[PDB]
Enzyme design. Structure first.
Site, short mmCIF file in Angstrom:
data_model
loop_
_atom_site.label_atom_id
_atom_site.label_comp_id
_atom_site.label_asym_id
_atom_site.label_seq_id
_atom_site.Cartn_x
_atom_site.Cartn_y
_atom_site.Cartn_z
N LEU A 136 -7.19 -3.20 7.01
CA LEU A 136 -6.43 -3.96 6.05
C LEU A 136 -5.22 -4.68 6.62
O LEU A 136 -4.76 -4.38 7.73
CB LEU A 136 -5.98 -3.06 4.90
CG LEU A 136 -7.04 -2.25 4.16
CD1 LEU A 136 -6.35 -1.38 3.13
CD2 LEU A 136 -8.06 -3.15 3.50
N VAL A 182 -1.52 -2.74 7.51
CA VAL A 182 -1.73 -1.38 7.99
C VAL A 182 -2.06 -1.41 9.46
O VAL A 182 -3.07 -1.98 9.87
CB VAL A 182 -2.88 -0.68 7.23
CG1 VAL A 182 -3.07 0.73 7.76
CG2 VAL A 182 -2.57 -0.66 5.74
N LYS A 209 -1.01 8.32 10.36
CA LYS A 209 -0.45 9.25 9.38
C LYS A 209 -1.47 9.50 8.28
O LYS A 209 -1.46 10.56 7.65
CB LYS A 209 0.88 8.74 8.80
CG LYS A 209 2.03 8.81 9.79
CD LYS A 209 3.27 8.07 9.30
CE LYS A 209 4.27 7.87 10.44
NZ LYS A 209 4.73 9.15 11.03
N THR A 225 21.69 6.66 -3.37
CA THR A 225 21.45 5.21 -3.38
C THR A 225 20.82 4.73 -4.65
O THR A 225 20.64 3.52 -4.83
CB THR A 225 20.58 4.71 -2.23
OG1 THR A 225 19.27 5.28 -2.32
CG2 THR A 225 21.23 5.00 -0.90
N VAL A 258 22.24 5.03 -7.35
CA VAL A 258 23.37 4.55 -8.13
C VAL A 258 23.61 3.11 -7.64
O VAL A 258 23.68 2.85 -6.43
CB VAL A 258 24.64 5.40 -7.88
CG1 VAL A 258 25.78 4.85 -8.68
CG2 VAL A 258 24.39 6.84 -8.26
N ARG A 263 13.15 0.79 -18.35
CA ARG A 263 12.53 -0.53 -18.43
C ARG A 263 13.00 -1.15 -19.76
O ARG A 263 13.32 -0.42 -20.70
CB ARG A 263 11.00 -0.38 -18.45
CG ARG A 263 10.38 0.26 -17.19
CD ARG A 263 10.38 -0.68 -16.00
NE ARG A 263 9.75 -1.96 -16.30
CZ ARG A 263 9.61 -2.96 -15.43
NH1 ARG A 263 10.04 -2.83 -14.18
NH2 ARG A 263 9.07 -4.11 -15.81
N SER A 288 9.97 -11.39 -14.76
CA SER A 288 8.74 -10.92 -15.37
C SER A 288 8.71 -11.23 -16.86
O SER A 288 7.66 -11.16 -17.50
CB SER A 288 8.59 -9.42 -15.17
OG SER A 288 9.63 -8.73 -15.86
N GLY A 339 12.77 -5.36 -15.79
CA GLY A 339 13.81 -4.52 -15.21
C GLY A 339 15.22 -4.91 -15.62
O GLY A 339 16.06 -4.06 -15.92
N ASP A 388 22.06 -10.98 -15.34
CA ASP A 388 22.56 -11.89 -14.33
C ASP A 388 22.61 -13.29 -14.91
O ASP A 388 21.73 -13.69 -15.67
CB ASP A 388 21.68 -11.86 -13.08
CG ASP A 388 21.94 -10.64 -12.22
OD1 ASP A 388 22.99 -10.01 -12.42
OD2 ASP A 388 21.11 -10.33 -11.34
#
Ligand code: NA
Ligand code: NA
Ligand code: NA
Length: 326
Positions: free
Chosen positions: A56, A59, A66, A95, A97, A143, A174, A183, A247
């Site tokens: 792929l 990858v 792994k 993180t 926060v 959400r 979105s 979001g 925003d």
DNA sequence: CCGACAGCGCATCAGC
DNA sequence: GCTGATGCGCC
DNA sequence: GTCGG
């Protein structure tokens, strides 16, 4: 399809990406793992070996290896010691926060501070942005239901007009792509009196939205960009609606649609467009669409009055915002 | 083997 | 006080 | 970490 197929593998990858980003501060490793984790998501077959996954894009040898160790042992040696790490776990969490990145997370964890409770006790060691991110920690991870978005939209648009009828305001992300959930809320603001040639323009908007009690907090504000927190009004006796990230960018009218296009994404879709514009003799950024010369040299911006013009130039049937995921 | 991987606005800090 | 560096978020 | 030159 469903998670079970390669969830164990994708989860590992995601966990690894977060580690590389939050702990190792290796943003490119983070993306490499994330890209591989998502491509392995699309895969309709139960990966039976690393070599298989290697076929792929995204990858390589390390992840393939792994995946081999994961299938055989069900675990990941590296991720194991990382979960034990009294520090890596804490730095990863902090993180979450908003306003706390890899650097601050590490400083906090070294000063003994590693839980939200610790943060509450040490509000003094946090800047203004971080205090807000702590305050709305949970609300920021929820959400936003599209239904709620529409309700917020009507408020912004209405208020924007209340200040000046010539103000153009569009909500992207979105949401503008139709999605059920979003979001945050991104709003692109423009006005006929603002072009790439020509302060109270963005300010009087934020100001007004503060007066009707929509915008409740400010993370950062300037003459072109604003990032803060808003909230819908309370329906009597009912739970106050959660606080949300909003925003508001003030973009020039002559580069507004390039803006609108860029911020509507998705980013993967844009890439399939940016890379297409590249082999057709055009360059697309956040501000302008430009013509290339033979030697890859750019040229002056080309007039764009609508998100449609961008597609015509690179000859690509105007894709619909509703189906623009990729 | 070796560099690129996006780049910018605002907040804040370091060096002066 | 200023200018430049840095941390943070973010299609 | 992976890809492309
Ligand atoms: Na591969
Ligand atoms: Na964060
Ligand atoms: Na967005």
């Amino acid at each position: 399809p469903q998670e079970t197929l390669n969830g164990g593998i994708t989860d590992m990858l995601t966990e690894l990406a977060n580690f590389e980003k939050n702990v190792s501060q290796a943003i490119h490793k983070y993306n490499a793992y994330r890209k591989a984790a998502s491509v392995i998501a699309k895969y309709p077959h139960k990966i039976k070996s690393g070599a298989e996954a290697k076929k792929l894009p995204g990858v390589g040898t390390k992840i393939a290896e792994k995946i081999d160790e994961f299938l055989a042992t069900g675990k990941l040696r590296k991720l194991e010691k990382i979960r034990q790490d009294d520090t890596s776990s804490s730095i990863n969490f902090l993180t979450r926060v908003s306003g706390i990145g890899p650097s601050a997370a590490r400083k906090f964890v070294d000063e003994g501070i590693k839980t939200l409770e610790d943060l509450r006790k040490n509000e003094d060691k946090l800047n203004h942005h971080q205090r807000i991110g702590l305050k709305y920690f949970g609300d920021f991870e929820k959400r936003i239901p599209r239904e709620e978005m529409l309700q917020m939209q009507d408020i912004v648009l209405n208020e924007v007009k209340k200040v000046d009828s010539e103000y153009i305001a569009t909500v992207c992300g979105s949401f503008r792509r139709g999605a059920e959930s979003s979001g945050d809320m991104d709003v692109l603001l423009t006005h006929p009196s603002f072009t790439s040639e020509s302060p109270k323009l963005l300010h009087q908007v934020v100001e007004q939205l503060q007066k009707v009690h929509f915008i409740t907090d400010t993370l950062s504000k300037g003459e072109t960009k604003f990032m803060g927190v808003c909230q819908l009004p309370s329906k009597n006796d009912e739970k106050e609606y959660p606080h949300r990230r909003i925003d508001i960018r003030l973009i020039p009218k002559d580069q507004y649609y390039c803006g609108v296009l860029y911020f509507t994404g998705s980013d993967i879709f844009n890439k399939n467009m940016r890379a297409h514009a590249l082999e057709k003799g055009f360059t697309i950024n956040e501000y302008t669409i430009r013509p290339l010369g033979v030697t890859g040299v750019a040229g002056e911006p080309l007039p764009v009055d609508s998100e449609k013009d961008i597609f015509d130039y690179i000859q690509w049937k105007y894709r619909e915002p509703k189906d623009r995921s990729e």
